[PDB]
C-alpha cells in the first residue's frame, strides 16, 4: 500500500516503536514516507549498550547526540551552544560534554556510553560533566513534536511514551560511501538489525489523538 | 629497531609525511612510539576529497575536525565554544560550523567537504558559515607543537611544512567494534591506505632543529 505499510498502520507503527524500545531494540525515525528522505537511529539513553553505541558509530555519522529536556539541561547547567542560532533547522545544540570521570580519549563506544550515563543519571550534577566534549546534547522544545517536529522532539516523545526517562540517543544513518541513507536504505538497515520504523508524522498524529480529552 | 623504524628515522618520518600530504595522501599521527597509544588521520583542508572524507567517516569517530589558526578563527569570527574550558587536554573547540550555502542535511561526506572548503577559502567571511553545525573547528595555539604538543598543532605544523595553507582535517581512527585503534592497528590501516606515519615527538624535534639559527 505505502512505503512503510509493511510495518503497520500509522498508529501501529508508533506502538511497534514503543514495543521495540521497551524490548531493548532500536528505532528508525523518518520524517515522512518520501522515499528520498533520510533517517535517524535512536535508543533510550538509559538502556543503550556499548554494542549499540558501536553500531551507531560504525553505520552513523559518528555525531552521536543526546536528546534531553529543558529541565535536564538546567540540572546539568549546560548553556546553549550559540545565542544567535543561525542553523537552518534551529537545532538545539548545547555545549558539548564529557564525563569528568571514567574516560580516556572519550571517543570510544564505551567512553561515549559512560558520558551519556553520567548526564542522564538520577542526581546528576554539572560537575559530573566536563565541557567541551565528544557527546552532543540536544535540547528538546517543551511540548515535543506538537511544538516542533524535529528528530530531537520525536526522540524524547518516543522515550516517554515507552515508559523511559525523557532522554534518548540519536544519530543519522550513513552509507559506507559517505552519502546519507535515504528511506529504502533505512528500511533495509532496520530490517537487518530488527529495528522498528516510524515517521514523525505518525507520532504527531498519534499524540494529537491520544491527548485530546 | 623500533615500532615505527620501518617508516624511517624520526626526521625521515616527518619528511615522508610532508611528501605524502603533497602527493594527495593521508598521514597517520601518533603521540609517540608506545604501542598502546591511539592515532589520528589527517588531510590538508585544501585538497581533501569527498572520498577521503567518506573514508574518514567510515573508519574514524565521525567527529571530523577542522584545524585552523587563530587568525582564521578571527577571520571567521568564531567564538571559542566555552569560556571556562574544563576538558582534560584543553581542546580548542570553537563553535561548530555549517556552510551557509550548498548543503542539505550537512552530514554527508560531500556536505562536510563543502563546509570545510567554505571555511578555508581565500576571502572567507563569517556569513559564509552558519552556527552551530556538523563540522568542528579546532584552534591551534600560536607556536604550533613548540607551544602545545596536541594533534591540532601537529596538524597545522605539518600542513605549513608541506607548503599548504595552515588548515587540516583530522579524525581519530576507530575500530569497527567501537574500541579505539591502538598503534599496531594504526600502522596496518596506514599501510593499507598508503598513508605516512609520524609522531608528535618526531615533529617537535624536527622543528626545534630546523628553526635554530
DSSP assignments along A50-78, one per residue: HHHHHHHHHHB-S--EEEE-HHHHHHHT-
Query: In angstroms, what CA-CA distances link A51 with A58, A160, B178?
Result: 10, 23, 8
Query: Which residues, 6 or more positions from B24, have their beta carbon under 8 angstroms from its beta carbon?
Result: B47, B49
Residue among A22, A66, A26 nearest A198 (CA): A26
Asked if residue B100 lies in contact with residue B130, where contact means CB atoms within 8 angstroms, the answer is yes
Can you tell me whether residue B163 is helix, strand or coil? coil
Distances (CA, A) of B11 to B17, B43, B141, B188, B200: 10, 20, 23, 21, 11
CB contact under 8 A, A63 and B62: yes
* Residue A34, number of CB atoms within 10 A of its CB: 12
Partners of A82 in beta bridges: none
Q: CA distances (Å), A135 to each of A22, A64, A83, A185, B105, in order?
A: 24, 6, 20, 26, 19
Count of domains observed in chain B: 1
Q: What are phi and psi of B46, to 5 degrees?
A: -65, -45
Q: Residue B69 has which C-alpha cell?
A: 589558526
- Edge-to-edge strands of the sheet including A27-30? A97-99, A129-139, A65-68, A168-172, A39-44, A27-30, A196-199
Q: Within A60-179, where are the H helices? A: 70-76, 109-120, 151-162
Pairwise CA distance, residues B188 & B174, whole Å: 13
Q: Which residues pair with B42 in a beta bridge?
A: B27, B170
Residue of B31, B48, B57 to mutate when probing chain A, most A C-beta within 10 A? B57
User: What's the Cα-to-Cα distance from A119 to each of A28, A122, B108, B114, B144, rounded to whole Å?
Assistant: 23, 9, 28, 33, 34
Which residues in chain B are contacts of A38 at CB distance < 8 A?
A: 105
Q: What are phi and psi of A97, to 5 degrees?
A: -135, 155
Residues of A in contact with B81 (CB under 8 A): 81, 95-96, 131-132
Instruction: Tell me, in Å, the resolution of the deposited structure.
Output: 1.9
At A38, give phi and psi (nearest 5°): -105, 175
From residue B139, alpha-carbon distances to B76, B86, B164 in Å are: 12, 16, 17
User: Does B34 contact A at CB distance below 8 Å?
Assistant: no
Q: Please answer yes or no on whether A38 and B134 come within 8 Å at the CB atom.
A: no
Contact, A152 vs A170, CB < 8 A? yes
Separation between Cα atoms, residue B158 and residue B27, nearest integer Å:
10
Q: Edge-to-edge, what's the strand order for the sheet holding B27-30?
A: B97-99, B129-139, B65-68, B168-172, B39-44, B27-30, B196-199
Contact A139, A69 (CB under 8 A): yes
What is the DSSP-derived secondary structure letter of residue B119?
H
Closest CA to B63 of B150, B170, B167: B170
d(CA B141, CA B127): 24
What cell numbers appear for B213 in the block? Answer: 639559527
Closest to B175 in 3D by CA, of A136, A101, A110, A103: A110
Q: Give the integer Cα–Cα distance in Å for B87 and A134.
A: 10
Helix (H, G, I), strand (E, B) or coil at A172: strand
> In 3-state terms, what secondary structure has residue B11?
helix
Tell me the three cell numbers of residue A36: 528520498
Contacts of B174 in chain A (CB under 8 A): 57, 62, 107-108
Contacts of B133 in chain A (CB under 8 A): 87
Phi, psi torsion values for B93, nearest 5 degrees: -65, 130
**Strand ranges inside B140-211, DSSP E:** 168-172, 196-199
CA–CA separation, B186 and B39 (whole Å): 6
Q: What are phi and psi of A177, to 5 degrees?
A: -85, 5
As given in the structure block, the three cell numbers for residue B5 are 623504524
Half-sphere exposure of B33 (CA within 13 A, CB side): 14
CB-nearest partner of B180 from A105, A177, A178: A105
Report the alpha-carbon distance of residue B188 to residue A20 in Å, rounded.
39
Read off the C-alpha cell for B125. 567571511
CA angle A48, B181, B50 (to 5 degrees): 90
In degrees rounded to 5, what are phi and psi of residue A160? -70, -40
Residue A99 in grid coordinates:
564525563
Half-sphere exposure of B205 (CA within 13 A, CB side): 14
Give the orientation angle of helix A10-22 with respect to helix A151-162, to 10 degrees.
70
Let me know how long chain A is: 213
Q: What are phi and psi of A128, to 5 degrees?
A: -75, -10
Residue A135: CB atoms within 10 Å: 26
Residue A141 contacts residue A134 (beta carbons within 8 Å) = no
Experimental method for this entry? X-ray
Question: How many CB atoms are located within 10 Å of the residue A122 CB?
Answer: 5
Full residue range of the structural domain in which residue A77 is found: 1-213
The Cα B141–Cα B153 span in angstroms is: 7
Burial class (CB in 10 A: 0-12, 13-18, 19+), B213: exposed
Task: Report in angstroms the alpha-carbon separations of B149 from A124, A213, B153, B179, B200.
Answer: 33, 62, 7, 24, 7
Q: Quick count: other Cβ atoms within 10 Å of Cβ B14?
A: 23
CA distance B204 to B199: 9
**3-state DSSP assignment of residue A45:** coil
3-state secondary structure of B171: strand
Place of cell 563506544: A109
Q: Which residue has the cell 579546532?
A: B138
DSSP H or E stretch at residue B98: strand B97-99
SS3 B27: strand
Amino acid at each position: 500500500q505505502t512505503l512503510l505499510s509493511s510495518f503497520g498502520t500509522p498508529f501501529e507503527r508508533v506502538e511497534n516503536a514503543l514495543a521495540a524500545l521497551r524490548e531493548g531494540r532500536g528505532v528508525m525515525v523518518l520524517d515522512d514516507e518520501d522515499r528520498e528522505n533520510e533517517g535517524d537511529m535512536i535508543f533510550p539513553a538509559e538502556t543503550m549498550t556499548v554494542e549499540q553505541m558501536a553500531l551507531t558509530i560504525r553505520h552513523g555519522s559518528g555525531i552521536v547526540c543526546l536528546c534531553i529536556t529543558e529541565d535536564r539541561r538546567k540540572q546539568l547547567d549546560l548553556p546553549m551552544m550559540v545565542e544567535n542560532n543561525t542553523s537552518a533547522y534551529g537545532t538545539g545544540f548545547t555545549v558539548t560534554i564529557e564525563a569528568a570521570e571514567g574516560v580516556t580519549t572519550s571517543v570510544s563506544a564505551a567512553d561515549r556510553i559512560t558520558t551519556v550515563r553520567a548526564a542522564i543519571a538520577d542526581g546528576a550534577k554539572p560537575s559530573d560533566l566536563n565541557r567541551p566534549g565528544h557527546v552532543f546534547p540536544l535540547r528538546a522544545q517543551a511540548g515535543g513534536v506538537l511544538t516542533r517536529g524535529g528528530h530531537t522532539e520525536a526522540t524524547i516523545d518516543l522515550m516517554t511514551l515507552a515508559g523511559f526517562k525523557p532522554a534518548g540517543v540519536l544519530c543519522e544513518l550513513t552509507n559506507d560511501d559517505g552519502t546519507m541513507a535515504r528511506a529504502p536504505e533505512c528500511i533495509e538497515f532496520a530490517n537487518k538489525h530488527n529495528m522498528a520504523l516510524v515517521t514523525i508524522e505518525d507520532l504527531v498524529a498519534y499524540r494529537q489523538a491520544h491527548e485530546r480529552k
